[PDB]
Amino acid sequence: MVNVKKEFVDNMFSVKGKVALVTGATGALGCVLSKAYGYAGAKVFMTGRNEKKLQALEAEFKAEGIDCAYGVADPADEAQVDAMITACVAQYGEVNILAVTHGFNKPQNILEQSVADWQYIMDADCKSVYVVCKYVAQQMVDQGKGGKIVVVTSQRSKRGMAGYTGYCTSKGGADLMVSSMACDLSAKYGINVNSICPTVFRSDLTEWMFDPESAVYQNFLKREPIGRLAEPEDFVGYALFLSSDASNYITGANCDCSGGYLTC
Amino acid sequence: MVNVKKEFVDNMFSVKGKVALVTGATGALGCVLSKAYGYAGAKVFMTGRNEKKLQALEAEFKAEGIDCAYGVADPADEAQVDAMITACVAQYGEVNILAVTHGFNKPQNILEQSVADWQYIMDTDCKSVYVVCKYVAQQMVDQGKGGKIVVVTSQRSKRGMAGYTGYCTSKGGADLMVSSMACDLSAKYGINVNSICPTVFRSDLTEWMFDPESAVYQNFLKREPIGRLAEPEDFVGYALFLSSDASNYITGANCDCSGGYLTC
Amino acid sequence: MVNVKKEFVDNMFSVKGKVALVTGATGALGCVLSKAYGYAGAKVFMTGRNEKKLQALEAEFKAEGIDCAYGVADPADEAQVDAMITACVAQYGEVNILAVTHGFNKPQNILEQSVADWQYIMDADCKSVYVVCKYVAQQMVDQGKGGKIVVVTSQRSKRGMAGYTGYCTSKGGADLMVSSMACDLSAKYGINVNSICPTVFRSDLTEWMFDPESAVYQNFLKREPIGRLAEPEDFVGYALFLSSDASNYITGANCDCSGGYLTC
Amino acid sequence: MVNVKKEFVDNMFSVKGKVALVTGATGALGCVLSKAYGYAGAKVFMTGRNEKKLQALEAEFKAEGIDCAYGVADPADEAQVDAMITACVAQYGEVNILAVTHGFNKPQNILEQSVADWQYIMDTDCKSVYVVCKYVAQQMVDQGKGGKIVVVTSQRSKRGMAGYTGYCTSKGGADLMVSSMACDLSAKYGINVNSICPTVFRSDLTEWMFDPESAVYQNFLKREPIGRLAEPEDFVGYALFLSSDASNYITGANCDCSGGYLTC
């Protein structure tokens, strides 16, 4: 008999009954991923800094029968992250999936960007990934059931850009932090750690879309073999795949969500 | 309201009712992927050179209610591939998914490997990918409904190896052929083209596993953050993901199925 | 005392008295590299298919005191390559450096490109690299003095492009063939094998430069952090570096000559 | 006539009369690069934190007719870096080449590595690269004559490793910071910015070389197509190449100094 089971294939993409902790939950990708986990049957614990926006999401999701909760925390603040994970464990008993979607950018040329401004991006966008991953991984180790970590980086983790010495250092570094975390955790504890590297969202560029003096929209479109800019919903499939049994062998990968921008 | 639909999330990983054409169908990965597509509800058209082995698979799958058929063809032979696609279209009406799993290798140092031996690997392992992709892409264009192509390459498409001047040229080339095919087809025709880059299967190395003189098994294990060698079933999730609506934005990618070998 | 010698530093970039065999010697990069090796004091053996163009180069170089010779050969023809290397050995006693610059392209979409047209690119652009490298490496092994091989690929060895299923397969494959050849030859025989991955030459695009309907020139310029397209002379430094003692530790590398196109 | 000049070829690798500022000058690679620039005729300005070790190097180099000087500075401290560059400008009139060789590592698994310990590596190894590059680039801009920046990263900038969540984030980030700096500076100001990615030095592993319980030495040797571990002198050629006219077109590159570790 061929070495594949029907039970495996039918349920491999499931996240049903799993507890998914989503950071940057009020952001463009974070709110979409949080709802997608909910629609897929996971218990959703949303975190971010804006309580009013988290409350609005919790009300919308609960009206559709999604089991969800939220915790306010600055992801770069070690004490707040620890308390937030404790609140998730108190609510749901465990953490099975972590989706890291928070971040920050402020593009500026190196000559005009102070060391403090560069450090601000690194703390908000890079240190915060270490803090959240370290504390959630420790919780997954404590549980002894393995787990899944999905870090949203950027196609900027592999390609530089003018004005991006902060963001590219942060994302370039996070991709390697993910591969090193897989080396630290996957074999011993059954914790898969992967990143997704998306291109830009259409909605991020619509503001200057009608400006003939701007080349930004067309510079991206010339470099998108898929033929269009991304929507957050375009990455829910990859995120859920990397959060399910279907990706049990996959670890330390930096997954291409660029629509071909990285390979053309 | 958050921009993601429940109907999208519930059905995004489906391949139900789709016609999946699988090359190298009698091989270790090919038979597993063929059955996985069948268990997932796709109509499966298997192709390979060994009729007796294809007949055995068809009998096994039909006994489990899988709708499948086969066609004998040498994938490097345009005329045989063209006739094989015609037989798939006659049986099922169309081709929606293509999974390319066939191949050949015969490692040998460049000094001892004749130009004819190198060419034999290139024809069997590389030219055959161009032939199958070109003819199936043309059928998908003719249909006007888009489609999915998944080419199985190898982690050897990105890392060289002693004795692999044939296989590494073929796989390294196929990864770029996939990115270029996405540039040719995805925007205009809605045909996504991606590759998966697997590490070795545990069963491929079981022969010399007990020989202390061989370092092969341990060479790979030291370089596998996941902590074990692969089974064909470990790649069914990625292959089905890349064959479904869940990956509609993903094209021209060379997906890391190495278990961390590529990133450590 | 610091572990570096003055004699080493003063002479590390030298190719003086070395025999450099350059393929595609009559082409834009080939003629420039051949003359640069000559100006740097190497004995230059030029090869290509056009005898009149090789004779013109030999006359120009000899008028400037360069020790050079030529041999006519189709680089994909195993018998002609063997005879050409024999003629170089008869003239100069040995081969120390090989620079592979020949090639062919004919861009065409996969749907319109016949299997025979794809194969034509592969034979002219990829098989020919295997033939030349195998025979020159065998000669270097026979000599027992090590050697240097520099293969000119393209930035297309790492990035796909519409119409390039032939060229990208050939260059993508050649980069991996180089890494595998380093695995086969460098430790045992002291033969370093590396590739250089250039961007396009300014002169290749000047024809359609005044056509407003063409985006080619600007598509490249937007993606060149260096701020201009390349001239063949821009790659002589990297080629000579990879042909000298200064790069003795460097092997199996695919060197970025893209002017930042690969990293932005 | 072939488009290459003899005067260009004869002098392209020269750093004679150029002012080379070397950070981490007392380290294994820093002292070797500092002396190599000196032997090549550059004016050498060495910086580091250990005054006694800088004084010993200055005395050794002056005894061999090298024009050199030193300045004590912590490279992560903007005020000290600014004062150090002022002292280099006062001594030599300008800065033409910058070689960044300093760094820090303390491997530790993520579960046992505090956020403060991770931050310590990031400040010492990553923030310090931003500080030095920003201040030296500003000095090169002020001069208006262009310049060369060579950042020494590691093969760890592209491959993760157990215990390296700090170092891999720092090096992975620095490679992207270099590509982004090239986008910010090369076209407008003629400042090329590149990195070199070395493998480990033989001397770094000699301690546990005789311990059968340690796999480290053999783990690297199995992955070195060149056939041996590196010496600092093995990277002087690449560093001087990237500091000379021979590499004028090369910018934003992350150069492979791994001996094939990256490509096998």
Side-chain angles (χ1 to χ4, degrees), chain A residues 1-51 53-206 209-264, chain B residues 1-51 53-123 125-206 209-264, chain C residues 1-51 53-206 209-264, chain D residues 1-51 53-123 125-206 209-264:
Chain A
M1 292 272 276
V2 168
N3 295 309
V4 69
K5 301 260 152 79
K6 186 183 203 304
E7 200 153 26
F8 174 72
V9 176
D10 286 355
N11 306 113
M12 55 178 181
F13 295 113
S14 181
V15 295
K16 185 178 168 191
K18 297 291 171 185
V19 175
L21 197 167
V22 180
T23 77
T26 66
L29 182 55
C31 67
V32 166
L33 289 201
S34 296
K35 206 172 197 188
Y37 281 122
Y39 282 160
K43 287 179 246 276
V44 185
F45 191 92
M46 297 177 287
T47 187
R49 287 178 290 179
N50 192 320
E51 192 163 16
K53 291 195 195 152
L54 289 161
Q55 284 173 330
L57 287 182
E58 184 191 48
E60 172 181 335
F61 291 14
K62 283 188 176 182
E64 291 180 54
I66 293 167
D67 191 351
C68 65
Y70 74 88
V72 184
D74 171 358
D77 187 312
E78 178 167 24
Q80 288 178 39
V81 167
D82 188 44
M84 181 272 293
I85 295 158
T86 300
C88 181
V89 171
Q91 175 87 32
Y92 292 130
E94 64 202 282
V95 52
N96 306 120
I97 297 158
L98 168 65
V100 189
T101 89
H102 67 270
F104 178 79
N105 197 8
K106 191 185 181 292
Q108 181 119 78
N109 186 291
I110 184 167
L111 303 176
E112 299 172 327
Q113 183 176 245
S114 69
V115 174
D117 283 3
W118 177 86
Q119 188 65 57
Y120 187 92
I121 295 165
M122 290 301 289
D123 291 345
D125 203 76
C126 189
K127 181 179 195 170
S128 59
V129 175
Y130 183 79
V131 172
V132 179
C133 291
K134 169 182 173 63
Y135 280 80
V136 171
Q138 187 62 254
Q139 176 57 36
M140 291 172 171
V141 168
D142 293 357
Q143 287 165 185
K145 291 172 211 245
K148 302 286 192 170
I149 297 174
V150 180
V151 177
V152 178
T153 64
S154 171
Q155 65 193 2
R156 297 271 74 89
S157 68
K158 285 167 180 299
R159 304 289 180 265
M161 180 164 260
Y164 279 59
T165 53
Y167 197 78
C168 284
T169 301
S170 170
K171 296 300 191 216
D175 264 12
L176 274 293
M177 196 200 295
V178 160
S179 301
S180 299
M181 290 186 287
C183 292
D184 280 350
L185 303 171
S186 304
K188 191 162 185 301
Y189 306 107
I191 305 163
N192 299 63
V193 186
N194 293 292
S195 63
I196 62 168
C197 305
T199 186
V200 296
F201 296 133
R202 174 205 41 89
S203 80
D204 300 327
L205 310 187
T206 49
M209 202 186 169
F210 317 96
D211 184 1
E213 293 197 353
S214 177
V216 182
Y217 181 78
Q218 274 310 325
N219 288 345
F220 279 107
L221 271 196
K222 284 281 189 206
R223 299 177 64 172
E224 291 293 350
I226 195 62
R228 62 173 181 86
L229 302 184
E231 297 303 332
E233 64 182 0
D234 291 324
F235 305 130
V236 306
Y238 229 132
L240 271 57
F241 167 60
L242 293 177
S243 303
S244 73
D245 286 336
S247 63
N248 280 348
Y249 195 76
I250 312 307
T251 201
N254 309 137
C255 303
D256 182 349
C257 280
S258 78
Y261 179 102
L262 287 169
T263 58
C264 81
Chain B
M1 293 273 263
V2 170
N3 295 310
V4 70
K5 300 171 308 300
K6 185 171 197 286
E7 203 157 345
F8 172 73
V9 176
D10 292 348
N11 305 296
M12 55 179 181
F13 295 115
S14 178
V15 295
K16 184 175 176 185
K18 297 292 172 187
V19 178
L21 198 166
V22 180
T23 78
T26 66
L29 182 55
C31 67
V32 165
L33 288 201
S34 289
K35 206 173 197 187
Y37 281 122
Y39 281 157
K43 286 166 198 288
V44 183
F45 191 92
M46 297 177 288
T47 186
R49 287 179 291 178
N50 192 320
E51 191 163 18
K53 291 195 194 257
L54 290 160
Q55 284 173 331
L57 288 182
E58 184 190 47
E60 179 183 325
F61 299 4
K62 284 188 175 182
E64 292 178 56
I66 292 168
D67 192 349
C68 63
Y70 75 88
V72 184
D74 171 358
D77 188 311
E78 294 192 69
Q80 289 179 37
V81 167
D82 189 45
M84 182 273 293
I85 294 158
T86 299
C88 180
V89 172
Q91 174 86 30
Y92 291 131
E94 63 201 280
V95 178
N96 306 119
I97 297 158
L98 168 67
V100 185
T101 90
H102 67 275
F104 179 78
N105 196 10
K106 192 183 181 294
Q108 186 53 279
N109 186 291
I110 184 164
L111 304 177
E112 299 171 330
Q113 181 176 245
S114 69
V115 177
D117 283 2
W118 177 88
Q119 188 64 57
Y120 186 92
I121 296 165
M122 290 300 289
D123 291 345
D125 203 75
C126 189
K127 179 181 198 171
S128 60
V129 173
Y130 183 80
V131 173
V132 180
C133 291
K134 170 182 172 62
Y135 278 79
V136 168
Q138 186 63 256
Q139 176 57 36
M140 291 173 171
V141 168
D142 292 354
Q143 288 162 189
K145 287 174 96 113
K148 298 281 184 159
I149 296 175
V150 181
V151 176
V152 179
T153 63
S154 172
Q155 64 195 0
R156 299 270 75 89
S157 75
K158 289 169 177 296
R159 304 289 180 264
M161 181 166 260
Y164 279 59
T165 54
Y167 196 79
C168 285
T169 301
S170 170
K171 297 300 190 216
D175 264 12
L176 274 293
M177 196 201 296
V178 161
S179 301
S180 298
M181 286 188 280
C183 292
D184 280 353
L185 303 172
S186 302
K188 191 161 181 53
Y189 305 107
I191 303 163
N192 299 64
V193 186
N194 294 292
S195 62
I196 62 167
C197 305
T199 186
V200 296
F201 296 133
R202 176 210 43 96
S203 302
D204 300 327
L205 301 187
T206 50
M209 207 200 164
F210 320 94
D211 171 30
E213 294 197 348
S214 175
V216 187
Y217 181 78
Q218 274 310 138
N219 280 352
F220 279 107
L221 271 196
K222 284 280 186 204
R223 296 181 65 178
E224 291 293 350
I226 195 60
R228 62 174 179 85
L229 299 182
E231 296 302 334
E233 63 184 358
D234 292 321
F235 305 129
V236 306
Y238 230 134
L240 271 58
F241 167 61
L242 293 176
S243 302
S244 73
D245 286 335
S247 63
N248 280 348
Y249 196 74
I250 313 308
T251 200
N254 308 137
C255 303
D256 180 352
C257 279
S258 77
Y261 178 101
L262 286 171
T263 59
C264 80
Chain C
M1 292 272 276
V2 168
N3 295 309
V4 69
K5 301 260 152 79
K6 186 183 203 304
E7 200 153 26
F8 174 72
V9 176
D10 286 355
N11 306 113
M12 55 178 181
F13 295 113
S14 181
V15 295
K16 185 178 168 191
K18 297 291 171 185
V19 175
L21 197 167
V22 180
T23 77
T26 66
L29 182 55
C31 67
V32 166
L33 289 201
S34 296
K35 206 172 197 188
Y37 281 122
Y39 282 160
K43 287 179 246 276
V44 185
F45 191 92
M46 297 177 287
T47 187
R49 287 178 290 179
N50 192 320
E51 192 163 16
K53 291 195 195 152
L54 289 161
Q55 284 173 330
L57 287 182
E58 184 191 48
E60 172 181 335
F61 291 14
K62 283 188 176 182
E64 291 180 54
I66 293 167
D67 191 351
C68 65
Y70 74 88
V72 184
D74 171 358
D77 187 312
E78 178 167 24
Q80 288 178 39
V81 167
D82 188 44
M84 181 272 293
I85 295 158
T86 300
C88 181
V89 171
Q91 175 87 32
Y92 292 130
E94 64 202 282
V95 52
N96 306 120
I97 297 158
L98 168 65
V100 189
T101 89
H102 67 270
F104 178 79
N105 197 8
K106 191 185 181 292
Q108 181 119 78
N109 186 291
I110 184 167
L111 303 176
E112 299 172 327
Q113 183 176 245
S114 69
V115 174
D117 283 3
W118 177 86
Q119 188 65 57
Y120 187 92
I121 295 165
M122 290 301 289
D123 291 345
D125 203 76
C126 189
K127 181 179 195 170
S128 59
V129 175
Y130 183 79
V131 172
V132 179
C133 291
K134 169 182 173 63
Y135 280 80
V136 171
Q138 187 62 254
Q139 176 57 36
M140 291 172 171
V141 168
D142 293 357
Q143 287 165 185
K145 291 172 211 245
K148 302 286 192 170
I149 297 174
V150 180
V151 177
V152 178
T153 64
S154 171
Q155 65 193 2
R156 297 271 74 89
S157 68
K158 285 167 180 299
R159 304 289 180 265
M161 180 164 260
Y164 279 59
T165 53
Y167 197 78
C168 284
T169 301
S170 170
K171 296 300 191 216
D175 264 12
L176 274 293
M177 196 200 295
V178 160
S179 301
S180 299
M181 290 186 287
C183 292
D184 280 350
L185 303 171
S186 304
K188 191 162 185 301
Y189 306 107
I191 305 163
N192 299 63
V193 186
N194 293 292
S195 63
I196 62 168
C197 305
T199 186
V200 296
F201 296 133
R202 174 205 41 89
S203 80
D204 300 327
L205 310 187
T206 49
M209 202 186 169
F210 317 96
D211 184 1
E213 293 197 353
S214 177
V216 182
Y217 181 78
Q218 274 310 325
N219 288 345
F220 279 107
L221 271 196
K222 284 281 189 206
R223 299 177 64 172
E224 291 293 350
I226 195 62
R228 62 173 181 86
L229 302 184
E231 297 303 332
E233 64 182 0
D234 291 324
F235 305 130
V236 306
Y238 229 132
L240 271 57
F241 167 60
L242 293 177
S243 303
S244 73
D245 286 336
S247 63
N248 280 348
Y249 195 76
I250 312 307
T251 201
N254 309 137
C255 303
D256 182 349
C257 280
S258 78
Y261 179 102
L262 287 169
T263 58
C264 81
Chain D
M1 293 273 263
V2 170
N3 295 310
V4 70
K5 300 171 308 300
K6 185 171 197 286
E7 203 157 345
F8 172 73
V9 176
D10 292 348
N11 305 296
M12 55 179 181
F13 295 115
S14 178
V15 295
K16 184 175 176 185
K18 297 292 172 187
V19 178
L21 198 166
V22 180
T23 78
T26 66
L29 182 55
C31 67
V32 165
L33 288 201
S34 289
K35 206 173 197 187
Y37 281 122
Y39 281 157
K43 286 166 198 288
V44 183
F45 191 92
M46 297 177 288
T47 186
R49 287 179 291 178
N50 192 320
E51 191 163 18
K53 291 195 194 257
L54 290 160
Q55 284 173 331
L57 288 182
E58 184 190 47
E60 179 183 325
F61 299 4
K62 284 188 175 182
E64 292 178 56
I66 292 168
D67 192 349
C68 63
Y70 75 88
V72 184
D74 171 358
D77 188 311
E78 294 192 69
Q80 289 179 37
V81 167
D82 189 45
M84 182 273 293
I85 294 158
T86 299
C88 180
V89 172
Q91 174 86 30
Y92 291 131
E94 63 201 280
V95 178
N96 306 119
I97 297 158
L98 168 67
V100 185
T101 90
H102 67 275
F104 179 78
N105 196 10
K106 192 183 181 294
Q108 186 53 279
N109 186 291
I110 184 164
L111 304 177
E112 299 171 330
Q113 181 176 245
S114 69
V115 177
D117 283 2
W118 177 88
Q119 188 64 57
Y120 186 92
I121 296 165
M122 290 300 289
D123 291 345
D125 203 75
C126 189
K127 179 181 198 171
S128 60
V129 173
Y130 183 80
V131 173
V132 180
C133 291
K134 170 182 172 62
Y135 278 79
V136 168
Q138 186 63 256
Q139 176 57 36
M140 291 173 171
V141 168
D142 292 354
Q143 288 162 189
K145 287 174 96 113
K148 298 281 184 159
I149 296 175
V150 181
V151 176
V152 179
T153 63
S154 172
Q155 64 195 0
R156 299 270 75 89
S157 75
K158 289 169 177 296
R159 304 289 180 264
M161 181 166 260
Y164 279 59
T165 54
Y167 196 79
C168 285
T169 301
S170 170
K171 297 300 190 216
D175 264 12
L176 274 293
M177 196 201 296
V178 161
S179 301
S180 298
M181 286 188 280
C183 292
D184 280 353
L185 303 172
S186 302
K188 191 161 181 53
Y189 305 107
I191 303 163
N192 299 64
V193 186
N194 294 292
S195 62
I196 62 167
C197 305
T199 186
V200 296
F201 296 133
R202 176 210 43 96
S203 302
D204 300 327
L205 301 187
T206 50
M209 207 200 164
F210 320 94
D211 171 30
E213 294 197 348
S214 175
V216 187
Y217 181 78
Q218 274 310 138
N219 280 352
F220 279 107
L221 271 196
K222 284 280 186 204
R223 296 181 65 178
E224 291 293 350
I226 195 60
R228 62 174 179 85
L229 299 182
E231 296 302 334
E233 63 184 358
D234 292 321
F235 305 129
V236 306
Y238 230 134
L240 271 58
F241 167 61
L242 293 176
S243 302
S244 73
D245 286 335
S247 63
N248 280 348
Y249 196 74
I250 313 308
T251 200
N254 308 137
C255 303
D256 180 352
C257 279
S258 77
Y261 178 101
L262 286 171
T263 59
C264 80

